[PDB]
Amino acid sequence: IFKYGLDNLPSNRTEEIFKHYTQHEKKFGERVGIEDVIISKRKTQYEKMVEENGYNYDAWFDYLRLLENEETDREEVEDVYERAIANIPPHSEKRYWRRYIYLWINYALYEELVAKDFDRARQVYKACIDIIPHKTFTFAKVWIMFAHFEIRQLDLNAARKIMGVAIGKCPKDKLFRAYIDLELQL
Amino acid sequence: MDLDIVQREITEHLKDVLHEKAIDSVDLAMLAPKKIDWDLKRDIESKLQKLERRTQKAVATIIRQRLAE
Amino acid sequence: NMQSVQARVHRSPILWAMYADYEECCGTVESCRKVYDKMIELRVASPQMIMNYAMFLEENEYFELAFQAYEKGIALFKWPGVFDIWNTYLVKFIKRYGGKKLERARDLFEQCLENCPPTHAKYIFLLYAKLEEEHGLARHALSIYNRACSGVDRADMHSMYNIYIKKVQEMYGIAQCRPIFERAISELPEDKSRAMSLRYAQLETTVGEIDRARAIYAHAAEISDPKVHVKFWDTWKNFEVAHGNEATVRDMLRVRRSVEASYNVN
Amino acid sequence: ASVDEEAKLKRYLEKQARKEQELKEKRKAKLEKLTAGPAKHMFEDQDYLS
Amino acid sequence: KKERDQWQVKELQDRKAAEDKGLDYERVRSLEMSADVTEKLEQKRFTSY
Amino acid sequence: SVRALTIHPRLNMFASASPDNIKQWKLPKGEFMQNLSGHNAIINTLSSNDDGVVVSGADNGSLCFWDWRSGFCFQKIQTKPQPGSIESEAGIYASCFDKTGLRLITAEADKTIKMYKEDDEATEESHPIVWRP
Amino acid sequence: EQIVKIGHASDSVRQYIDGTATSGLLTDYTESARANAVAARTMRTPMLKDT
Amino acid sequence: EWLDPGIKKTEWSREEDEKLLHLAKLMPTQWRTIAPIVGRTSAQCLERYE
Amino acid sequence: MMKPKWHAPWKLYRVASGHTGWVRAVDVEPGNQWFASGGADRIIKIWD
Amino acid sequence: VMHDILDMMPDGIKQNKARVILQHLSEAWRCWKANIPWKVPGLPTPVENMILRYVKAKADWWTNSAHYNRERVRRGATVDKTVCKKNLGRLTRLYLK
Amino acid sequence: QNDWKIPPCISNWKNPKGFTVGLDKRLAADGRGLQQTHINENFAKLAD
RNA sequence: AUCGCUUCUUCGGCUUAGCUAAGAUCAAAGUGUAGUAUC
Ligand SMILES: O=P(O)(O)O[C@H]1[C@H](OP(=O)(O)O)[C@@H](OP(=O)(O)O)[C@H](OP(=O)(O)O)[C@@H](OP(=O)(O)O)[C@H]1OP(=O)(O)O
């Protein structure tokens, strides 16, 4: 009955179903049934938060944690990262971007470490750097991480171009230190 | 029966957080002792060091290949 | 006919407890579970019997079955009686499972706190905050304190505020602590709201927001009297002679004689 | 009214003040009185005694 | 009356023994009473015309 | 209080209005026919039309038009009172139709007479009504 | 935000350099900041230009 | 003049004294009009002003 | 219910101001040429 | 006004309190003549709207008869004298208003 | 039922029962506090 | 583990009998009768 209800009810009314359904499974579910209902409850509960405010970055981070621990299918996690990322801060002042920028870095870490699609992690960084308002401020983390990523691809020419346009657009101390430490290691 | 046992876990909160005696100074650390992103950075650090170890292994081949030619 | 003596007899809490003890002694696990599960079905089990049942399954190391034994106990009773089951359930879960299963652990506290009456709510809000601090994310831990001072109700909301004050200060500094002082002064009762006003004035005067400090004191002065609260007026007077001047010292003495007139109806 | 309410509040507080030793003693007094149970009867049936 | 009083003295000294320990005793009493008496308490616990 | 009556000018049928409901009745018996509802103001006018329209005006100035045959409501007009009177005075209490049945005259607590007329410009295709039994 | 940036930069430099046999040529950057801050704390509201 | 509630028999602050001198310069002698604005009434204005 | 008959919207086009008190009558002449109205100003006014 | 109150209310209510609304009506009229602003703070304001209509309606009838009697008095050559003292009272109030 | 919680009338004038209803309630009807007074700054231009 | 009478406190419900020109208007003093206290 609970499981049948979840299908035809799926968004709005399931909020009642899930609280009883999860209590039900809390006995009988114990290995497979508990974790399934709580995660799927949590999944729809984060989607409620995203429908209320897509600017709730802490809800996206907690949502992405759930799906990565699920080992959710890659295309669904990409759709959730790309939904999360589209919520660019309305203020265009760096104090508001400090939480939003890790919503891109986590995506590049997922694409590099979990999906292992390095040609798609380039596109994550290019899309990231094409969105930061560089003539007002920069995240040196982005330019550093994008530079070191191409070094892991053994492409020094790309890595130097990244750090080179970093200094050219926004000469910043964290960039110089990172670029110098790189050339010293090389 | 240890009816109190919930209290034993939260003893740190009940002892050192449940009150504050006074405040009468300020310093550069106290104005901002952790950055507003410190916990996002924390959750990345386990994954970030795998990238670091790949980078150190990668840069070792970049040097080795340069001297091979 | 259902003669009452035998018809009642199976509601036998002394005897069910004796039966359960023998099954622990001689039953082996699977029969012992059936006996306790039937004792739940009858609604004969005390909360001590649920906790005894879980400790049996825990000592066997059927830990997952212990958690549902608590869960089924929580369905059986209602507050206050559930409180010891929640205490044992939430701490027992938190120890082994509480790191990895944290996603499931947050569901337990939510499920508790939705039902929790204010006086018991204090301790459970604090263990939730401990879990979310150490394993969880920082903003969620702070949000539990914002929830805690609303839930706890008025006699001990002051304890939840002073934790929230300390923990925001410990991570985001005193400049982000300003709003929850203003909430406290507006919400906790007048004996502590005066105390919070002195606390808040100490921050603004060490940072040097002396113009804000006056409005803190002046807003506290209207629910204080110079006839018994002399320590408040002394600390404001010591502030105004230090950080003030003739044009505002006289402003202090105006509100003083105004406020005493409110009480001194004789 | 200010004199009367000050006195009445004080006497309310003073009864409330240390409302535990009296209650614990009065509970103790009641408990021991019941448990003492049978007092001696000392019956009066003097014509039986005759 | 005697049976009524045996229950009164039984619970009161149980308060005393808990109080001699120094304890929450309304919670301790809550343990045993809650199974049956919560069923009894469910029985215990403009628009005029 | 039944403050208004109207006899439908070409059926053996009449309507009467109270704050509770507007009710319809079959004559001569006086037997009951289904109610026009949701105009929960103090009503005191009814006018009924040769074409089958009834209109009910209310002390709060609101004005409902209805189809006699079905009790469907398909206009709510709120009168706005003429200068220097706005909040209380908006009310209505008279109505009559002209003898053709194509103009309505209403009398108003704002000390004005107002006259109403039927729109024509592109109406029937923009407005429709479905079935909804 | 500007204040804590400048402060943390200066203090970190102090901890790196100091504790060396030719120190004392350095004016105690963290402790002198403390000394300056406690001196500045005494301050008052000015009166009024009009009255 | 005296005995109404809300007649505000307290000390003259800064802005009330400011408003009274500002209004004495603006009005000349209008004191019954000045009295509503400062709501300290007519006698209170005049004796304070003088 | 059954099938509402469609009727055209009703639109306003007069405000005749001239009673000095509430209006509370209208009737239309048989001739349809003029209507009378009566008011809380105790006066009957005949309008065309 | 009494009929309007009873219809205004819906069912099952204190309606003997409707007699209290007529007191509020009379006070709203006296305040109008005084030119004191009548505002009862807690009033069932659909009741306020209805009272304010009937007060203004009386005020219209009361001013219009003040004009009409005075025009008669200017033409007056008749034993007006009680009507004169009435009309002087009304016109004194209308002036000061 | 609360929406029709009609406050009792307290007259400044009539009082046929002769009751004493005096200080606070009788002023609470008075309403004097609501209309604040402010003045056009033209008066400063006129004076100076 | 079920059981009864009474006292007490304590919560909600529990009515100004029109109108007008606020209807109109502002003497106090001395003589006669009734009420309270003392021999
Ligand atoms: O601008 P810099 O003097 O080179 O300071 C940088 C920079 O700080 P800014 O916010 O002032 O730019 C980094 O900040 P981001 O640009 O990356 O946002 C910051 O990184 P975090 O914000 O992650 O703290 C980093 O600090 P760290 O190297 O500890 O990450 C810090 O470098 P300094 O330690 O040299 O001040």
**What number of residues does chain K have?**
48
d(CA I14, CA F79) in angstroms, rounded, equals 12
Name the minimum distance, in Å, from the CA of B40 to any CA of chain G. Answer: 19
Describe the strand order of the beta sheet including F31-36 as a list of residue ranges. Answer: F4-7, F13-17, F22-26, F31-36
* Distance of alpha carbon I20 from the chain centroid: 17
Can you tell me whether residue B14 is helix, strand or coil? helix
F35-58 burial code (b ≥16 CB/10 A, e <16)? ebeebebbbbbbbbbebbbbbbbb
Residue C140: HSE in the Cβ half-sphere, 13 Å Cα cutoff = 23
A41 Cβ closer than 6 Å to some ligand 1 atom? no
Peptide bond into C80 cis (omega under 30): yes
Q: In 10 A of CB F1, how many CB atoms?
A: 14
Answer for the pair J61, J53: CB distance below 8 angstroms, yes or no: no
- Treating both helix axes as pointing N-terminal to C-terminal, what angle do A32-52 and C102-113 enclose, rounded to 10 degrees? 70
Q: Tell me how crowded residue H46 is: count the other CB atoms within 10 A of its CB.
A: 14
> Phi and psi for F24 in degrees, rounded to 5?
-115, 150
Q: What is the DSSP code string of J40-88?
A: -TT--THHHHHHHHHHHHHHHHHHHHHHHHHHHHHS--SS-HHHHHHHH
H helix runs in A13-155, sequence order: 14-28, 32-52, 57-70, 74-85, 94-109, 118-129, 140-152
* Ligand 1 mean position, distance from CA A174 (Å): 7
Chain E contacts of B3, Cβ < 8 Å?
23-24, 27-28
Q: Is the CB of G4 under 6 A from ligand 1?
A: no
3-state secondary structure of E34: helix
Q: Which two tokens stand for residue B9?
A: 């876990």
**DSSP letters along G31-49, please?**
HHHHHHHHHHT-------S
Residue C7, number of CB atoms within 10 A of its CB? 10
Q: Which of C112, C125, C216 is nearest to C163 (CA)?
A: C125
Q: Are A160 and A166 in contact (CB under 8 A)?
A: no
Centroid of chain to Cα H18 = 10
Q: Identify nearest nucleotide to residue E11 by CA to C1′ distance.
A: L1
Q: What is the identity of the amino acid at E3?
A: E
Q: Looking at the DSSP assignment, which residues form a beta bridge with residue F55?
A: F47, F65
Amino acid at A31: R
**Helix count (H) and strand count (E) of chain C?**
14, 0
Could you give phi then psi for residue H26, rounded to 5 degrees? -75, -50
First to last CA, chain B: 76
The HSE-up count of residue I23 (CA atoms within 13 Å, CB side) is 30
Residue A98 Cα: closest atom of ligand 1: 18
Identify the sign of the CA torsion I43, J1, J6, J10.
Answer: positive
The residue whose CB lies within 8 Å of the most ligand 1 atoms, and thus the one to mutate among A96, A101, A129, A174, is A174
CA nearest to F123, candidates C80, I7, K46: I7
With a CB cutoff of 8 Å and minimum separation 6, the contacts of A157 are none
Residue of F19, F14, F104 lying closest to F59 (CA atoms): F19
- Chain-centre distance for alpha carbon J82: 21
List Cβ<8 Å contacts ≥24 apart for F121-124.
F123/I8, F123/I9, F124/I6, F124/I8
**Residue G5 labelled as part of a binding site:** yes
DSSP category for residue A89:
-
Longest dimension (CA), chain B: 76
* C-alpha to C-alpha distance for F109 and F77, rounded to whole angstroms: 16
Closest nt to J87 (CA→C1')?
L21
Residues of chain H contacting C, Cβ within 8 Å: 10-11, 13-14
Q: Which amino acid is present at J75?
A: R
**Residue J40, token pair as written in the block:** 């009862």
Rounded Cα distance between A175 and A159, Å, is 12
Chain L nucleotides close to protein (CB under 7 A) are 1-3, 12-24
Phi, psi of B65 (to 5 degrees): -75, -35
As a whole number of angstroms, the longest Cα–Cα distance in chain D is 72
- The answer to whether I21 faces chain J, any CB pair under 8 Å, is yes
Question: Which atom of ligand 1 is nearest to B41's Cα?
Answer: 23
Q: At how many degrees (to 10) do helices C63-76 and C29-41 cross? A: 10
Measured CA distances, C247 to C48, C234, C261, G43, H6 (Å): 68, 18, 22, 15, 26
CA I7 to chain centre: 20
* Token representation of residue C56: 């049996």
Question: DSSP labels for C207-265?
Answer: HT-HHHHHHHHHHHHTT--TTT-HHHHHHHHHHHHHH--HHHHHHHHHHHHHHHHHH--
Query: What's the rounded Cα separation, in Å, for the pair A131 and A97?
Result: 11
**G51's tokens:** 């009255």
Let me know if C107 is exposed, middle or buried by CB neighbors in 10 A (0-12, 13-18, 19+): buried
Query: Residue C86: in which H helix or E strand, if any?
Result: helix C83-96
Per DSSP, A113 falls in state: I
**C11 nearest nt, CA–C1':** L1
Is the CB of residue K12 less than 8 Å from the CB of residue K26? yes
E20 touching D, CB under 8 A?
A: no
**Method in brief:** cryo-EM
Rounded CA–C1' distance between D35 and L3, in angstroms: 21
Q: What subunits touch chain D, counting only 3 or more CB pairs under 8 A?
A: C, E
Report the alpha-carbon distance of residue C13 to residue C21 in Å, rounded. 12
Contact A152 B44 (CB under 8 A): no
E9 and D34 within 8 Å at the Cβ level: the answer is yes
Cβ contact A33:A25 at 8 Å: yes
The strand pairing partners of F54, in sequence order, are F48, F66
Q: Please check whether residue C217 is in contact with residue C239, taking contact to mean a CB–CB distance below 8 angstroms.
A: yes
The Cα–Cα gap between I23 and G17 comes to 96
Instruction: Please report the beta strands in chain C, taking only residues with DSSP state E, as ranges in sequence order.
Output: none
Cα distances (Å, whole numbers) of residue A185 to A143, A160, A162, A172, D11: 18, 14, 17, 20, 83
Name the pairing type of β-strands F62-67 and I44-47. Answer: unpaired
Q: Work out whether strand F53-58 and strand F62-67 pair parallel, antiparallel, or are unpaired.
A: antiparallel
Strands F31-36 and F43-48: unpaired
Residue C255, both tokens: 């509100």
Euclidean distance between CA atoms A98 and C112, whole angstroms: 34
**One-character DSSP codes across F5-56:** EEE-TTSSEEEEE-SS-EEEEETTTTEEEEEE-S--S-EEEEEE-TTSEEEE
DSSP state of A111: I
Neighbouring chains of F at 3+ CB pairs under 8 Å are I, J
- Dihedral angle over CA of J78, J83, J89, J93, nearest 10: -90
DSSP bridge pairs for F4: F17
Return the amino acid letter for F34: Q
Q: How far apart are CA F36 and CA I1, in angstroms?
A: 11
Are residues J17 and K29, on separate chains, in Cβ contact within 8 Å?
A: no
Pairing status of strand F73-78 against strand F62-67: antiparallel
- How far apart (Å, rounded) are the C-alpha atoms in residues J56 and J62? 9
Query: Do the Cβ atoms of J89 and J64 come closer than 8 Å?
Result: no
User: A103 and A97 in contact (C-beta within 8 Å)?
Assistant: no
Rounded CA separation A179/A159 (Å) = 10
What are the tokens at A9? 């009810």
Q: Helix (H) and strand (E) counts for chain E? A: 2, 0
Alpha carbon distance E28, B2 (integer Å) = 11
Three-state helix/strand/coil letters over B39-50: HHHHHHHHHHHH
- Both tokens assigned to F126: 């923009």
Q: Would you call B39 and C207 a contact, using CB atoms and an 8 Å cutoff?
A: no
- Which residue is listed with tokens 């006289």? C250
CA K6 – CA K22 distance, rounded (Å): 20
- Kindly state whether F88 is in contact with chain J, defined as any CB-CB distance less than 8 angstroms: yes
Interface of C with A in 170-229 (CB under 8 A): none
E strand or H helix at K32, and its extent? Answer: none
